[PDB]
């Protein structure tokens, strides 16, 4: 023990001598390969997601460069990590939500959607023939009884609901920033700016929101993002 | 740097290669040489046949697929028969459904698709055979080449198998003549190219040459043994 | 009718801390009697019995397949099955064959293995359970049996009075049915014993 | 590595080397480019002629995947042809099920998810190809997508794949393609292929050109022979 | 698809090392405790809950299976959720056939048999969880443990996860038969306090109880009350 | 129509069957045997639909013999009867039902003689005597009239004869000869055909 | 049942009676036969209630998922195609006569009929159900190219009222919906609000 | 059978008779036809008794798994969907005709569910062989927003109409009252029918029945 | 896939099946389990590994399983594997009863389970079950019987045997003390204790550390009982009295 290894425990999802799953641990490192960080925060009235939008090229159609996705009309998500893996998990989420509504006659709760995706990821940590997906999903929506919700699931199949959270390269620094504070849209954007040390242009982040007044998932335009950046700048 | 990457067709090497595909292609390079070429009106195949010993018959190299299509093979015999049987079946299905011959380029596409599948699945292997395909349809004569990689090529002329580089050099040298050649001239060119693959002391004989021809007024026909004699004389001595 | 091909009659009846279950003894094929000692009531426990009327082949198959399931249950659970639980096990067995049913309509009679409370029920051929506090009947002379039971049954009968009542209800009901009879067997189930009797009966 | 034999195995740094190796097969192939402009999409491919024995047209790297959709490929050509068949089937199934022509973005996303499925398992290998899809319609305008062996899919103003991708992108960046027509852009495509072609290492190539736009009424088509030849003449004379 | 060969096999000394290593995952998990009182059962567990940021109510470690059975674990959370879902399904399958709630021991046997499968079936690893299962039936309380091998044990009291050896010796000193549920809750919390670190609140522990009325989680306010005295 | 009869005495079981195979208006065989030896002390007598009768009886026969080879001893008559019933019942609602009516006669060391009746539905009844076929309608009452449980074998053969003579007198079908066998502790014995 | 839909410049009007019968017992006298399939796409249902509810629920699921994937409002023609595919494929096991009508930004107000058997045709206006037989003449005589929304609602209400008078299998209230770029406006005509036409009693 | 339901101001009232017949003979005089679905949802059943029993049991069980997972009280729409999708799949061969009522986060809801899988959401419904008699009562007397006691009266009057006018219906009236704050499962609610008092005394002595054989087996 | 396969069902170069041998080592470390046949019955006696603690005592035994009316078994080895096999034994026994309407003869039940164990050694690529079993029974063909099976799918019939910890030493003691044709249940029991006393090297033998089950015939019916702790303490006491008289 202390980093020990036997047989194929670094190659497939079997236990190491300490009871670790190295392949799952490596899937967390895969999340950071993309070099991005995302932040999410809930208050009483709304839940918000913000992530970096890096468009180094310009030969890109920047309207197709997004990590924000609509799952249903009332559930939004930000993906962090390997892009193709992420898109796959978004597709699965969309399917699960649609199937839930068809079978049960009401919209899937955000906590149930997160749990289902997490349970699907769990399988990949226990069956040897496929890898985990190297991505992390953060979901937002309004629950009719509990108000705004933010949920995160990961490649280990853990999930939780949060007051605020983060994912990607600066997850730990975002977590410290948000912990200190917790002891909404401006908090999210300030957290991300602080831990990256950037001071953003409106084209360098994306923002999505759900509110108790307007439960439909909405992606802010550049102009709407700029009204927040300017309001902050004037402290 | 090579051994862990060379046994499974599903393992990419660090250089972006698949060694099992490259190794399957060595099966074709070690097959006896065959040549294919075309004029405006005919497609011809010419093949050297190997006899294992002096008392064995020479191995067939040229196979009938349909009235309008035949093939010459190089590489694993059993894979060649499997692929030939697939081609035959696709041709029969086209005539059954549409009452017309399967266009040759469409058949080749089907071979590409079929032969690609095992290159991507664990525990399967590439086909260890290369084909030269002679055909005639509404777009005229054709010579195609298929490979264990599942790639295929539309050819003015081609040679595959052992010492086929020599044949290819002859073909490039004379290819501006082929379109306008009568059938006799075209077959002669094929035989001259094939003869370039031989050790200096060996010659084309009625025992080691096989010929396949298809064209505008000629269904795919195979010429062996005494039937290749008209074509062999012929022929400027080396 | 499929259910009248072999004929036959079963009934169960509740008393004061006792139950009774009875059956005719005829195995016949349409008009022809074949034997007069055909078993229709089967033990499922020391104080728990099932009676099956209907198509003789299925009477036997259901009793045997049920015993297979019950034996496994008792080995796994380490206890005797409760009467209500056996009812549910039988219902599940019959309803598996919802679209090609067994042609048998069981009655169950017993005492709870721990509390000794009386239980009786019947089920239709696809496993609809009916629990009652008085009596249940099944067979080709159900109407005749209802007539006798409605007229004679009383609450809280002692074992001797329960015996006479179930016996008279069976004997007189089957004597108005061409394809039931050739003898009547009766089991009286009490906390401390089982009493089994065959009755003096018409053999026509 | 030790860690680079299966697409079901992460390396300790979180890489899937089998996918990276498949990307190396693409990066060894000659260059293809796509450019979206005001009224359509134009593709061009540096098609190396490995033998003068091949017909002019052999090993096409440009495909019609639906009447309105073209596909341009680089990498292992058997894998690319397989993906073109997957794309075609997806487009055909879409029309049968929904009753209209598949939107380019949706086709790209569906084929990308198929490519992605081959990056998770020891049972199969990643495709050794990258490809572009291009379309035009009056309702959706011009659209150009590119999909790589990992299954990532993005939309582009201009794109290049294969061995001179970076050199090509730097030339594409000099064009104001948003304001240019397909008939202008073909020339530029030809020019850029000639610039990035390494005539010392690999003599002989064919230029392959296709387009889809207002001028083709939203149909993906080969560039007509006379226009290709005037584009080549422009590219050659621009090179000196 | 699926690998069809076992990933757990016998070593030359007769050990199933993947099961031993699954047990090491359990040993490094957060502590859990179970105590069978005369009139009920308590299950208690520590939340390995960093961050103020967690919504502590959003996921529960102490989970109902039926009206009368509940569970907790030590080890890998996501593996636990698999077993919770299966246990719930097993309990309903039983109820459909027998029309009686599943006896605690029957539920444990069926869940243990699932865990056994994952030590032998193709292309999977064992579960990295041990379960503590409580219930009430035949007028009597039950407490069971089911381990990664599929072995199960009936306990009067026990601990699992980090510092379990000391938790069991703490319970051996403190448990007696005729003890009541309210007292047992207290001693279960004291057992967690033995290996806690960092001040207990009603938000970083979870407690569930089982008696004649059924299984239920204690509310945060109920736990806060018991935490006064500790 | 085919006739089977069995009569169980204290320590034996006597069985007989007609020897006719008929088709349409003709007898096509007059020495047909409807009995199948399952083991040293068990006979299965089988009648019913063509094809089904032999296929079923021979399947049972092979499986009874297999049990003996696998285990080193034989199935009891009772166990063999229940095996037979299980198979027939299991087939009843399948794609391959067997339309066969049977008697099984046996002797067990410890339990003595047994006679079992089964119909095509697979209802199984143990009986002191039984018969199958239209001929049973004319003979069962003779058995009811004259049988006793202690009936000797020399009397049982006379009782059997009276039944067979009744068929010659009163039954509309031509059944002129019958196979007769008896089973006891010493195995299966062939008796003289009873012929008219 | 009687169902109907009618195109205008910028939208559609849909209507139905409200009667569901088993034999000649009225099991529901206030049935809602106009079912939303998406924001601006409805179907009008006739034939077996089990079949049309099952098919409508399935299409709603299919179209919802499609619309999320495309991130765009669905086409009316796509909704109709999905109904058609299901009604055609399962034509031997369904008794379903459907009208699909709605609005989308590409083609505006549109009406499709998917009658029993699963053909699909776009129409200016469509009628269906058992009661439609009695109003072919009326609709043929009354229809005019270029009708306004308020004229199309009147036309529909009048046609349905006529059918309901004559068809034993139709009756109750008239449910109407108008769909346009602005949304969906639903209303019920009941009792004295239902257009009235005298019985031709004798002079 | 007569089963029925109404939506009243604060909830749902369900009702049922208690006769089960086999052919034209009463088998059960006290059959329970109001089935548990969840603590806030009940379902009356008519049609083929095994099918209504097994169908309600299955959906109740699947709903319990659902609520165990969600941690929320189930919705009436969910029970409706599960029931109707299953009945549809079976093409009317499961003969369950159901009146489903409950109260969820969106308030009171009442559905009729038919064997082929059609459902109707309505403020009052009836099913079974007595359903027209019960419906006549509802058409004549239902008003929206009735108080609890008025609604209970109305439903029992409707069940009584079936009891007295349908040969397929009889014995007692059971009700189930469901609101946000309470569930009253009232079995029996009313007992309009009683067997006549017995006039002739039989009392058969010991030995009246002649016995041929006897075996006593002592137990435990 | 080929890279990660253990190849559990192949021969080694000396014709050995290594997984079977390694399973046999697991069994050798498990609780001592013995079986003795007598004229009037058969017994099983097993070391308990649920060796006490705060353990709760809820079933009638730890390692003794009733299989049907006429048979029981005990196990040594992986407990979860034993649970799978004992369930399967019960099913096989009920299938046989269903088919024949008589109880499965003892040797046939053993054989049927052993064919399953054997299959796990020959195909499927799974680990074998890590269990040896002792079976006790009565049937009408051979009366009182004792079998042993192990993970190879081999079995044999025994008058007396032992599996699990110190089995070799236990079998020596049995060879020397067992009286072929002359053992009663009373004397077999005395011997069982003598043997467990010598082979339990975990301290002075105690009733809490053993389980004993007897199988007898009474009035045409098989009786299977697990001795209560009172009876086991008495047998241990009689053994300790007898070792004193030995002087
Ligand atoms: Cl939906
Ligand atoms: Cl060759
Ligand atoms: Cl070869
Ligand atoms: Cl190639
Ligand atoms: Cl070559
Ligand atoms: Cl069964
Ligand atoms: Cl069962
Ligand atoms: Cl495998
Ligand atoms: Cl769950
Ligand atoms: Cl709770
Ligand atoms: Cl109406
Ligand atoms: Cl129609
Ligand atoms: Cl219609
Ligand atoms: Cl209609
Ligand atoms: Cl619904
Ligand atoms: Cl009814
Ligand atoms: Cl048994
Ligand atoms: K894995
Ligand atoms: K009308
Ligand atoms: Mg009678
Ligand atoms: Mg008579
Ligand atoms: Mg047949
Ligand atoms: Mg239908």
XYZ file of N, CA, C and O in Angstrom, chain G residues 43-141:
396
model
N -53.008 17.496 -32.992
C -53.718 16.533 -33.831
C -55.165 16.399 -33.403
O -55.518 16.765 -32.256
N -56.015 16.088 -34.370
C -57.403 15.851 -34.124
C -57.567 14.367 -34.260
O -57.112 13.814 -35.254
N -58.212 13.750 -33.295
C -58.251 12.283 -33.234
C -59.627 11.702 -33.480
O -60.609 12.150 -32.891
N -59.679 10.723 -34.356
C -60.866 9.921 -34.582
C -60.486 8.464 -34.736
O -59.346 8.136 -35.087
N -61.465 7.592 -34.468
C -61.298 6.155 -34.538
C -61.150 5.662 -33.110
O -61.662 6.260 -32.187
N -60.488 4.543 -32.931
C -60.263 3.981 -31.622
C -59.510 4.948 -30.679
O -58.367 5.316 -30.977
N -60.138 5.275 -29.553
C -59.546 6.120 -28.565
C -58.210 5.543 -28.000
O -57.264 6.293 -27.830
N -58.148 4.247 -27.752
C -56.920 3.636 -27.325
C -55.778 3.838 -28.330
O -54.656 4.257 -27.957
N -56.076 3.576 -29.592
C -55.097 3.710 -30.658
C -54.618 5.155 -30.869
O -53.414 5.376 -30.957
N -55.549 6.111 -30.919
C -55.155 7.442 -31.201
C -54.420 8.075 -29.991
O -53.493 8.838 -30.208
N -54.817 7.756 -28.768
C -54.076 8.219 -27.591
C -52.655 7.640 -27.569
O -51.699 8.378 -27.278
N -52.534 6.347 -27.913
C -51.219 5.660 -27.863
C -50.299 6.266 -28.937
O -49.148 6.553 -28.668
N -50.844 6.497 -30.127
C -50.050 7.001 -31.247
C -49.644 8.466 -30.994
O -48.500 8.818 -31.186
N -50.604 9.267 -30.571
C -50.316 10.655 -30.198
C -49.248 10.779 -29.107
O -48.324 11.574 -29.270
N -49.318 9.974 -28.032
C -48.298 9.967 -27.015
C -46.906 9.595 -27.553
O -45.897 10.228 -27.197
N -46.855 8.607 -28.447
C -45.604 8.187 -29.024
C -45.011 9.242 -29.929
O -43.821 9.481 -29.891
N -45.823 9.866 -30.750
C -45.343 10.917 -31.661
C -44.853 12.146 -30.867
O -43.860 12.739 -31.211
N -45.567 12.476 -29.807
C -45.185 13.601 -28.908
C -43.782 13.357 -28.374
O -42.926 14.229 -28.426
N -43.538 12.118 -27.926
C -42.202 11.705 -27.466
C -41.153 11.839 -28.553
O -40.090 12.468 -28.328
N -41.430 11.253 -29.715
C -40.487 11.283 -30.857
C -40.168 12.740 -31.288
O -39.011 13.105 -31.479
N -41.216 13.547 -31.441
C -41.063 14.897 -31.901
C -40.371 15.812 -30.876
O -39.573 16.666 -31.251
N -40.675 15.618 -29.592
C -40.011 16.344 -28.528
C -38.507 16.129 -28.556
O -37.719 17.070 -28.476
N -38.104 14.848 -28.650
C -36.676 14.501 -28.652
C -35.981 15.086 -29.876
O -34.951 15.737 -29.753
N -36.627 14.950 -31.030
C -36.142 15.494 -32.300
C -35.905 17.007 -32.194
O -34.858 17.528 -32.597
N -36.870 17.675 -31.571
C -36.828 19.133 -31.465
C -35.705 19.613 -30.538
O -35.048 20.593 -30.861
N -35.457 18.905 -29.431
C -34.318 19.197 -28.557
C -33.006 18.981 -29.290
O -32.097 19.787 -29.197
N -32.905 17.883 -30.025
C -31.674 17.604 -30.778
C -31.358 18.669 -31.817
O -30.219 19.045 -31.965
N -32.366 19.083 -32.574
C -32.180 20.120 -33.590
C -32.124 21.549 -33.044
O -31.705 22.445 -33.767
N -32.535 21.754 -31.786
C -32.600 23.071 -31.168
C -33.432 24.061 -31.995
O -33.074 25.222 -32.160
N -34.542 23.585 -32.517
C -35.427 24.374 -33.358
C -36.844 23.902 -33.202
O -37.072 22.710 -32.840
N -37.806 24.808 -33.512
C -39.193 24.370 -33.488
C -39.435 23.351 -34.595
O -38.872 23.446 -35.675
N -40.227 22.342 -34.306
C -40.455 21.312 -35.290
C -41.360 21.781 -36.440
O -42.208 22.659 -36.263
N -41.145 21.197 -37.612
C -41.997 21.413 -38.755
C -43.325 20.658 -38.634
O -43.372 19.493 -38.186
N -44.417 21.291 -39.066
C -45.716 20.588 -39.054
C -45.649 19.330 -39.907
O -46.194 18.248 -39.541
N -44.981 19.457 -41.047
C -44.784 18.329 -41.960
C -44.011 17.140 -41.324
O -44.324 15.967 -41.612
N -43.109 17.433 -40.406
C -42.381 16.397 -39.640
C -43.323 15.692 -38.671
O -43.322 14.428 -38.620
N -44.166 16.451 -37.964
C -45.164 15.832 -37.111
C -46.078 14.881 -37.891
O -46.335 13.717 -37.457
N -46.550 15.351 -39.037
C -47.449 14.565 -39.876
C -46.724 13.325 -40.389
O -47.329 12.229 -40.401
N -45.454 13.484 -40.778
C -44.650 12.334 -41.260
C -44.491 11.276 -40.190
O -44.541 10.073 -40.503
N -44.307 11.704 -38.950
C -44.149 10.757 -37.836
C -45.460 9.980 -37.592
O -45.446 8.763 -37.309
N -46.599 10.671 -37.650
C -47.885 10.005 -37.544
C -48.089 9.017 -38.667
O -48.495 7.864 -38.424
N -47.778 9.482 -39.880
C -47.902 8.658 -41.088
C -47.053 7.380 -40.973
O -47.552 6.299 -41.256
N -45.794 7.508 -40.560
C -44.921 6.367 -40.465
C -45.493 5.323 -39.535
O -45.530 4.122 -39.884
N -45.990 5.761 -38.392
C -46.594 4.841 -37.422
C -47.963 4.254 -37.866
O -48.203 3.043 -37.763
N -48.837 5.108 -38.379
C -50.149 4.700 -38.867
C -50.067 3.779 -40.091
O -50.911 2.885 -40.224
N -49.045 3.945 -40.937
C -48.827 3.086 -42.114
C -48.240 1.773 -41.714
O -48.783 0.726 -42.056
N -47.126 1.825 -40.976
C -46.458 0.601 -40.506
C -47.413 -0.335 -39.753
O -47.360 -1.535 -39.947
N -48.234 0.222 -38.867
C -49.153 -0.587 -38.056
C -50.635 -0.559 -38.518
O -51.542 -0.702 -37.724
N -50.840 -0.332 -39.812
C -52.163 -0.110 -40.388
C -53.047 -1.330 -40.139
O -54.209 -1.170 -39.907
N -52.494 -2.494 -40.058
C -53.333 -3.663 -39.759
C -53.783 -3.764 -38.290
O -54.680 -4.547 -37.985
N -53.152 -3.014 -37.388
C -53.425 -3.083 -35.970
C -53.904 -1.793 -35.355
O -53.882 -1.677 -34.130
N -54.291 -0.823 -36.178
C -54.779 0.456 -35.692
C -56.061 0.804 -36.404
O -56.245 0.454 -37.543
N -56.944 1.521 -35.715
C -58.118 2.148 -36.306
C -58.013 3.627 -35.916
O -58.470 4.061 -34.862
N -57.334 4.380 -36.769
C -56.953 5.747 -36.427
C -57.115 6.620 -37.636
O -56.556 6.299 -38.665
N -57.882 7.711 -37.521
C -58.046 8.659 -38.641
C -57.670 10.001 -38.029
O -58.390 10.471 -37.117
N -56.552 10.567 -38.476
C -55.930 11.704 -37.809
C -55.878 12.918 -38.715
O -55.695 12.779 -39.911
N -56.015 14.102 -38.121
C -55.665 15.341 -38.810
C -54.571 16.018 -37.995
O -54.717 16.167 -36.806
N -53.486 16.375 -38.658
C -52.375 17.084 -38.018
C -52.404 18.518 -38.529
O -52.485 18.762 -39.735
N -52.411 19.466 -37.612
C -52.448 20.857 -38.041
C -51.694 21.740 -37.089
O -51.644 21.498 -35.865
N -51.092 22.764 -37.657
C -50.285 23.631 -36.854
C -49.617 24.718 -37.629
O -49.950 24.961 -38.794
N -48.636 25.328 -36.969
C -47.851 26.394 -37.530
C -46.387 26.128 -37.295
O -45.998 25.639 -36.226
N -45.570 26.442 -38.292
C -44.140 26.560 -38.071
C -43.570 27.740 -38.867
O -44.231 28.225 -39.816
N -42.357 28.207 -38.499
C -41.837 29.457 -39.149
C -41.452 29.297 -40.618
O -41.310 30.277 -41.325
N -41.334 28.055 -41.087
C -40.866 27.823 -42.425
C -42.014 27.798 -43.418
O -41.897 28.346 -44.493
N -43.096 27.101 -43.092
C -44.240 26.914 -44.023
C -45.546 27.506 -43.514
O -46.526 27.375 -44.185
N -45.570 28.137 -42.347
C -46.782 28.755 -41.844
C -47.857 27.735 -41.448
O -47.533 26.622 -41.006
N -49.125 28.107 -41.616
C -50.262 27.259 -41.197
C -50.472 26.093 -42.140
O -50.535 26.272 -43.348
N -50.542 24.873 -41.611
C -50.646 23.718 -42.465
C -51.564 22.665 -41.863
O -51.576 22.493 -40.648
N -52.305 21.996 -42.735
C -53.235 20.890 -42.395
C -52.868 19.655 -43.192
O -52.810 19.709 -44.416
N -52.666 18.550 -42.486
C -52.406 17.257 -43.088
C -53.455 16.254 -42.639
O -53.803 16.207 -41.444
N -53.926 15.441 -43.569
C -54.777 14.266 -43.227
C -53.944 13.025 -43.283
O -53.217 12.840 -44.276
N -54.102 12.193 -42.251
C -53.528 10.840 -42.186
C -54.738 9.926 -41.900
O -55.027 9.599 -40.763
N -55.453 9.575 -42.940
C -56.649 8.736 -42.722
C -56.266 7.294 -42.428
O -55.087 6.905 -42.475
N -57.269 6.486 -42.159
C -56.991 5.074 -41.943
C -56.238 4.473 -43.130
O -56.550 4.744 -44.308
N -55.246 3.655 -42.812
C -54.349 3.084 -43.797
C -52.957 3.734 -43.862
O -51.999 3.128 -44.310
N -52.885 4.983 -43.446
C -51.628 5.698 -43.278
C -51.093 6.416 -44.506
O -49.885 6.604 -44.637
N -51.950 6.827 -45.432
C -51.498 7.815 -46.452
C -51.396 9.177 -45.768
O -51.872 9.349 -44.645
N -50.770 10.142 -46.434
C -50.661 11.520 -45.895
C -50.822 12.490 -47.051
O -50.172 12.332 -48.068
N -51.652 13.513 -46.870
C -51.867 14.511 -47.888
C -52.079 15.857 -47.167
O -52.744 15.923 -46.126
N -51.440 16.901 -47.679
C -51.712 18.260 -47.285
C -53.013 18.743 -47.946
O -53.265 18.469 -49.121
N -53.836 19.433 -47.171
C -55.107 19.966 -47.677
C -55.366 21.400 -47.174
O -54.908 21.763 -46.112
N -56.140 22.176 -47.918
C -56.603 23.493 -47.456
C -57.445 23.398 -46.211
O -57.402 24.255 -45.340
N -58.288 22.385 -46.195
C -59.042 22.046 -45.019
C -59.310 20.544 -45.078
O -59.260 19.933 -46.127
N -59.520 19.961 -43.923
C -59.719 18.525 -43.801
C -60.863 18.230 -42.856
O -61.090 18.971 -41.918
N -61.590 17.142 -43.118
C -62.602 16.676 -42.210
C -62.463 15.177 -42.029
O -61.926 14.487 -42.869
N -62.889 14.689 -40.888
C -62.828 13.243 -40.649
C -63.713 12.849 -39.511
O -64.484 13.678 -38.962
N -63.671 11.561 -39.214
C -64.605 10.934 -38.321
C -65.931 10.532 -38.945
O -66.255 10.876 -40.065
N -66.684 9.729 -38.214
C -67.964 9.188 -38.644
C -68.935 10.313 -39.124
O -69.665 10.138 -40.082
N -68.902 11.451 -38.464
C -69.841 12.518 -38.801
C -69.471 13.333 -40.006
O -70.328 14.069 -40.532
N -68.220 13.190 -40.472
C -67.770 13.908 -41.657
C -68.596 13.595 -42.909
O -68.796 14.502 -43.765
N -69.118 12.358 -43.031
C -69.933 12.005 -44.188
C -71.037 13.069 -44.431
O -71.280 13.482 -45.567
N -71.646 13.531 -43.349
C -72.844 14.375 -43.462
C -72.558 15.823 -43.826
O -73.498 16.583 -44.109
N -71.324 16.210 -43.727
C -70.931 17.593 -44.066
C -70.042 17.749 -45.278
O -69.619 18.880 -45.558
N -69.769 16.687 -46.071
C -69.027 16.925 -47.342
C -69.659 17.997 -48.255
O -68.962 18.912 -48.756
N -70.951 17.867 -48.502
C -71.702 18.833 -49.268
C -71.610 20.261 -48.751
O -71.311 21.185 -49.510
N -71.852 20.418 -47.460
C -71.799 21.711 -46.804
C -70.399 22.363 -46.959
O -70.306 23.529 -47.358
N -69.334 21.608 -46.642
C -67.976 22.162 -46.738
C -67.599 22.475 -48.177
O -67.044 23.611 -48.453
N -67.985 21.594 -49.098
C -67.735 21.839 -50.512
C -68.457 23.126 -51.007
O -67.966 23.812 -51.903
N -69.665 23.375 -50.517
C -70.431 24.551 -50.957
C -69.986 25.830 -50.260
O -70.249 26.929 -50.777
